[PDB]
Automatic annotation (TrEMBL), chains A, B:
Keyword Metal-binding: yes
Residue sites binding Zn(2+) 1 per the record: E142, D178, E247
Positions with a binding annotation for Ca(2+): E142, E247
Residues at which Zn(2+) 2 binds: D178, H203, E247
Protein name: Xylose isomerase
Keyword Protein transport: no
Keywords for this protein: Calcium, Isomerase, Metal-binding, Zinc
Species annotation: Paenibacillus sp. FSL H7-0331
Amino acid sequence: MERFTNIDRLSLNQITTNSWSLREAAEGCVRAEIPWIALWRNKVEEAGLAESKRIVRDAGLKVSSLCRGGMFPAATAAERAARIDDNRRAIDEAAELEAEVLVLVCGPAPDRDIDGARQMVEVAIHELVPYAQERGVTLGIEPLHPMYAAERSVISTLAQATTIAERFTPQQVGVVVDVFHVWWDPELYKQIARASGRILGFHVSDWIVPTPDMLLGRGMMGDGVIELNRIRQAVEAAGYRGPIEVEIFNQAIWDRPGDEVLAEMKARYLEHV
Amino acid sequence: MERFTNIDRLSLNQITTNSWSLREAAEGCVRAEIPWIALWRNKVEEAGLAESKRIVRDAGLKVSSLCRGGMFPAATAAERAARIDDNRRAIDEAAELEAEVLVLVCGPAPDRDIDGARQMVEVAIHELVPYAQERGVTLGIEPLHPMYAAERSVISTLAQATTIAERFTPQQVGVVVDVFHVWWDPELYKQIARASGRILGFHVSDWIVPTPDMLLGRGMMGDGVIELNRIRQAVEAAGYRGPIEVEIFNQAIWDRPGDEVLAEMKARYLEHV
Ligand SMILES: [Ca+2]
Ligand SMILES: [Ca+2]
Ligand SMILES: [Zn+2]
Ligand SMILES: [Zn+2]
């Protein structure tokens, strides 16, 4: 169980420094010698597609993931069509931004019919896959924590996302493992091994006791209860050699100037992850 | 699509009327003609074992569950022995109070080793079941929501509790289905059908948007997103003819005088559940 030697596999999700814009973020990651960055669609729209592309290409930055496509379930069918056209836009944004994986959180159920919303998710992805494969982008389903099933999206366990991804070849669809959303799982390592050759991303955070916020309760590594090194050795034995993003939703760490939190990021990425 | 015509299957868990004592609770349910009550160990110790039995024996009340045994994982072995001695004391309390099922929430992991804590849970239950069957009490494992995996207990999915219960006879150990802790599950109905002939209790609440508290985020039926009628028809097709407890953890419903909340309880038990 030895530690990493470089930060070449490290990546920085924009939302761990939500205070910063995209070019402030890029400056911060080259200042901290961080090679990989994960871009958010709202910040890219803030800056501009071509402008953001220039920003992170003259920083010499590689793009791990673009967040986030999805939000498939809607109350009616024209709304679903608009949502999957927004997913096509997100696909194009990932294509010209050279993103490795387009992260998909799929959307919550509009009513109480949760299984119907899951079926909507599956048919929407099956549809979206040709337009994704045409432009060289791969879609990665990110299972969320079951406490987000009512609010943010409907895929709640890793087994479910792996089942959805198994219908398509790994080059078309894969899964995204975030330790915050699935560390609790009793069948954690079994499902991780089952999803091997199909893992497209790895995000790291920690589960804090006690939870401050439901939507903003993540923290940085080493302060919570998750056994990070074990999970990521499991995901590397699963054949995942890609970048490792750290994605933290926390107000207390967002208010802090980003240089502090990127120093702490690298230090405890080398110590724990 | 059906409803209930009587309230003979309804039960009242003490903790949805946390303000009231045990004799206040018994008086409230005889005033409301509610036949079944579920008792908590702290209030029973407050009143006294023999006294509490007399209180609920001249009220003509039947007792569905006793809350709560468990808390098996501990940092050391003498501590685990003490925890299972307290579990023996809870078994005795359930036996002399004529409780149908002794509810077990199993306890959190002391460190970060969660799987070791799960192993501790199962070996503790395996030890505890002879002393339980001897006194005529049946243990019922209650799987909690995965967001409680860090804090309150370690069994987080229905499949896990059913797997633990399958080792012992249905008369020895069974599972407790609460819609708050298991409504999210993608394999909900499949695991419910798998757990048939072994369901010992049914708790109902609703998942509110947005969650007020993580540990006190339940509400009364009809105010959330849970498909209560579907889940309880699934567990009734599973052969569960026992009482239906309603267990709500909410400050907003705790402020109310208990007559209000038991009136609303019956109204929305017949209307929704
Ligand atoms: Ca993400
Ligand atoms: Ca309970
Ligand atoms: Zn993540
Ligand atoms: Zn419960």
